[PDB]
Ligand SMILES: C[C@@H](O)CN1CCN(CC(=O)O)CCN(CC(=O)O)CCN(CC(=O)O)CC1
Ligand SMILES: C[C@@H](O)CN1CCN(CC(=O)O)CCN(CC(=O)O)CCN(CC(=O)O)CC1
Ligand SMILES: [Cl-]
Ligand SMILES: [Cl-]
């Protein structure tokens with residue numbers, strides 16, 4: 001599923017992501033735009049052999065199981081495929097664990113280089 005901007009803000013806000021660990025709702029919609037282009041089915045191979053999955057591109061090195069990343073962890077206890085669903089529940093619960101772990105939203109390289117220090121509230125402007 002490719003989400004519209006307002007539609008993704010209303011789903012993230014219903015799943016409790018708004019000001020989660022102090023990060024406003026515009027930071028999460030901003031990240032999703034530059035990680036996946038709002039597309040739940042997005043995948044990218046990394047050079048160490050791990051893969052990023054879904055609307056927030058969550059890494060198979062630590063967070064989920066794809067059966068092809070040797071001696072990796074599955075700390076969200078999910079298959080990688082669960083993070084490709086039109087239902088973003090799996091992805092949101094998985095991102096709450098990651099952003100709680102010491103480094104905050106710096107875990108997302110596109111957040112760090114394209115959303116940190118900008119007008120992030122612009123990403124939810126106009127939505128009800
Ligand atoms: C709502 C309109 O913006 C729709 N829109 C009209 C055309 N726009 C004109 C403009 O954006 O003022 C120029 C192209 N646009 C550039 C950009 O968005 O920054 C990329 C495509 N957009 C993506 C989007 O906006 O979600 C969809 C089409
Ligand atoms: C031509 C305009 O599209 C200029 N536009 C500024 C105003 N936009 C326009 C809008 O989408 O209504 C609203 C804010 N916008 C939200 C979003 O688009 O997703 C993020 C910033 N954008 C990034 C981008 O386009 O990729 C900068 C370019
Ligand atoms: Cl915001
Ligand atoms: Cl594996």
Ligand SMILES: [Cl-]
Nearest residue numbers: 021103104105
């Ligand atoms: Cl923080």
Ligand SMILES: [Gd]
Nearest residue numbers: 005033122123
């Ligand atoms: Gd824009």
Ligand code: NA
Nearest residue numbers: 060064072073
């Ligand atoms: Na894994």
